[PDB]
């Protein structure tokens, strides 16, 4: 379906007035599905699932019970969990969970901090052989997504390969790989995205993203019934800075991958 899937993906770009980037790999058959998979998009909040994976590589399960504190002036826009616990701090595991499950932006910034900032995040991905992802800024400036500006960008193929390493591969011991996938499962932020485009007997652990220039992303590990997982990265963006986005574009792209695999 090399050219057959190309046509369907090209058709979605027109129906939703957007640019689409797709990479999916069936971990059981190593069959891949790709479209503009080497083009750069701003990754926006999808980094949070990978940064949680780096955090888990670098810290014990025990240490996730350690309390982390921060200040009111550390709070950035859209921090619906962290804004409630300024006076007490949160457990480190709770912060990582807030970043993955709710896309809490202060929690994302703490994750960054704990793994050495954007530069430390990038260095961890380079260690896993990701040469493509470029991390430069904290929330919320990392969402600026200026076309042609490679700060805080990656490709569908690079992001999917990283997610594969953390969730099914050998980037984490089993127990932490399980902690990560559970954080990624059952979150409402994912409900209209890849989860809305797979059949109802499939299970989806995802991480969604949204940025300026209509940037709208979802990355996932998905389990068909009785079947090895498929890793999916779907990226989208537009040409106008204040452009809106349409969840349905991600869901329709997912339907195309499902039919092809």
Q: CB 86 → Cl ion: shortest distance, Å?
A: 6
Contact 12, 20 (CB under 8 A): yes
Question: What's the residue count for the chain?
Answer: 261
Tell me the C-alpha distance between 180 and 161, whole Å. 16
Structural contact between residues 134 and 146, judged by C-beta atoms closer than 8 angstroms: no
Binding to Cl ion by CB under 5 A, coded x per residue (else -) over 12-51, reads ----------------------------------------
Task: Write out the two tokens for 111.
Answer: 């994750």
| Closer of 68 and 145 to Cl ion (Cβ) | 68
Q: Does the N-terminal peptide bond of residue 233 adopt cis geometry, omega within 30 degrees of 0?
A: no
| Three-state DSSP state, 88 | coil
Which residue's CB is nearer to Cl ion, number 71 or number 200?
A: 71
Assigned token pair, 219: 């990355």
Is 45 a known active-site residue? yes
- For Cl ion, give the closer residue by CB, 72 or 131: 72
72 near Cl ion (CB under 5 A): yes
Active-site residue, selected from the candidate residues 66, 83, 141, 240:
141
Of these, 71, 88, 200, 244, which contacts Cl ion (CB under 5 A)?
Answer: 71
* 131 sits near Cl ion (criterion: CB under 5 A): no
236 beta partners: 20
Q: Which of 45, 154, 208, 236 is catalytic?
A: 45
Query: Which residues are part of the catalytic machinery?
Result: 45, 141
In the complex, which residues of this chain contact Cl ion (CB under 5 A)?
Answer: 71-72
């Amino acid at each position: 379906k090399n050219q057959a899937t190309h046509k369907e993906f090209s058709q979605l770009e027109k129906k939703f007035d957007a640019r689409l980037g797709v990479y999916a790999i069936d971990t059981g058959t190593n069959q891949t599905i790709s479209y503009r998979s080497n083009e750069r998009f701003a990754f926006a909040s999808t980094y949070k699932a990978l940064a949680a994976g780096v955090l888990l590589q670098q810290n014990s399960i025990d240490s996730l019970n350690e309390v982390i504190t921060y200040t009111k002036e550390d709070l950035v826009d859209y921090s619906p969990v962290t804004e409630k616990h300024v006076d007490t701090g949160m457990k480190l595991g709770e912060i990582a969970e807030a970043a993955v499950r709710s896309s809490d932006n202060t929690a994302g910034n703490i994750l960054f901090n704990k793994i050495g900032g954007p530069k430390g995040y990038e260095k961890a991905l380079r260690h896993m052989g990701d040469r493509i992802t470029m991390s430069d800024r904290f929330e919320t400036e990392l969402n600026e997504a200026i076309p042609g500006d490679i700060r805080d960008t990656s490709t569908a193929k690079a992001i999917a390969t990283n997610l594969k390493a953390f969730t099914v591969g050998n980037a984490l011991p089993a127990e932490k790989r399980k902690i990560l996938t559970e954080w990624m499962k059952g979150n409402a932020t994912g409900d209209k995205l890849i989860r809305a485009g797979v059949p109802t007997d499939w299970v989806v652990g995802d991480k969604s993203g949204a940025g300026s220039y209509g940037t709208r992303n979802d990355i996932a590990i998905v389990w068909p019934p009785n079947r090895t997982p498929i890793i999916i990265a779907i990226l989208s963006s537009k040409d106008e800075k204040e452009a809106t986005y349409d969840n349905q574009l991600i869901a329709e792209a997912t339907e195309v991958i499902v039919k092809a695999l």
